[PDB]
Amino acid sequence: VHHPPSYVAHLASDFGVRVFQQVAQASKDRNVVFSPYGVASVLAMLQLTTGGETQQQIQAAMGFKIDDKGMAPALRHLYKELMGPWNKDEISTTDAIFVQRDLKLVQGFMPHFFRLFTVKQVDFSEVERARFIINDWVKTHTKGMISHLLGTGAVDQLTRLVLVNALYFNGQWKTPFPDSSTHRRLFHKSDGSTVSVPMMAQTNKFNYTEFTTPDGHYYDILELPYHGDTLSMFIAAPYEKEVPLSALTNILSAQLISHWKGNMTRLPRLLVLPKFSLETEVDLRKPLENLGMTDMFRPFQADFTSLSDQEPLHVALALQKVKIEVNESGTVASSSTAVIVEIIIDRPFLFVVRHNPTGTVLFMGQVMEP
């Protein structure tokens, strides 16, 4: 464990979880898959382009200033840790900034962006080409998983800046579920009704801890490691079907996950887990405004003087796309965030894909219906 990457990863992951809780609030009984590291990555970049109180608001919500001593080195060290070969499991994370070809950038932004995290020349008056350029780049850096990050109406002639992160993960269980154990079983939805889904089964030693909500709701917390022994998926489900999953998501944090992991012991048991493939696209405006980042969305009031004195700029929209597939052999998942300037789990559950040496939360979500 290295301190620098683990420090910034905790802040990053915690900030991401708080954004997730905001999205989960809005879609109480809907499948949500999210990427905390993903949204933290672009907003870390956004700290560089903004100024005054617009920047302050981002800094306060994230818990750190990108420009503070040792802070950027920690973020670079971080994604090096995630992408190292020793992980066995593949992670690819790439940040990018696309700027209007002829936009006059403040002197020193380019060299400052390089040594902390080069820009890519784009012509937004050429709308569809510029949208393709960016969509094509997100596509390769998600290995094809996300082909159209920016829909039609995401950029136009007036667009000047697009910050983007692309995350990819894969994704092999330390011990796979045998294909032949996969069977159909009723899943209990939040509305009481049942649906029949394919579920995976296996008997092994699983890192496990019991957990109790303030309201006394008992939860199973299970850890499913990937073969590299650095990354794992945490699964959290209520002992009884009746308990709403928000009880858990309301109290979630990066610290709690670490505290779970700190208290688990390997126990033998049969684990029945549904397979799932979730796809979510979320508008990040309200969730980000809720965490106090309101100024960046307001025309004229937003402050991007760290990027350009040439003209007033504001955030037109903020968005994230995430995909995740969980099956017998492992997990494949990717996200792209942009800013435009016997334990049977047959009820809804939480999942968290975490890199444990750093505490980085790559993906998390609630499975309301597999």
- Whether the Cβ atoms of residue 258 and residue 118 lie closer than 8 Å to each other: no
Q: How far apart are the first and last CA of the chain?
A: 35
Q: What angle do CA 279, 339, 51 make, to 5 degrees?
A: 150
- In angstroms, rounded to a whole number, what is the distance separating the alpha carbons of residues 11 and 254? 8
Task: State the method.
Answer: X-ray
User: What is the radius of gyration, based on Cα positions, of the chain?
Assistant: 21
Domains of the chain: 33-168+279-323+341-351 (3.30.497.10), 169-278+324-340 (2.30.39.10)
Task: Tell me the CA distances in angstroms from 141 to 144, 153, 352, one per residue in order.
Answer: 8, 22, 22
Is residue 46 within 8 A of residue 314, CB to CB? The reply is no
CA distance 150 to 122: 15
Contact call for residues 6 and 359 (beta carbons, < 8 A): yes
Contact of 163 with 45, CB cutoff 8 Å: yes
8 A C-beta contact, residue 337 and residue 165: yes
Distance CA 229, CA 89 (A): 9
Residue with token string 């020349």: 121
- Of 242, 314, 324, 245, the C-alpha closest to 280 is 324
Residue 312's closest CA among 332, 296, 336? Answer: 296
Question: What resolution in angstroms, rounded to 1 decimal?
Answer: 2.6
> In terms of Cα–Cα distance, which of 183, 218, 181, 199 is closest to 345?
199
Helices (H) and strands (E) in the chain, counts: 9, 15
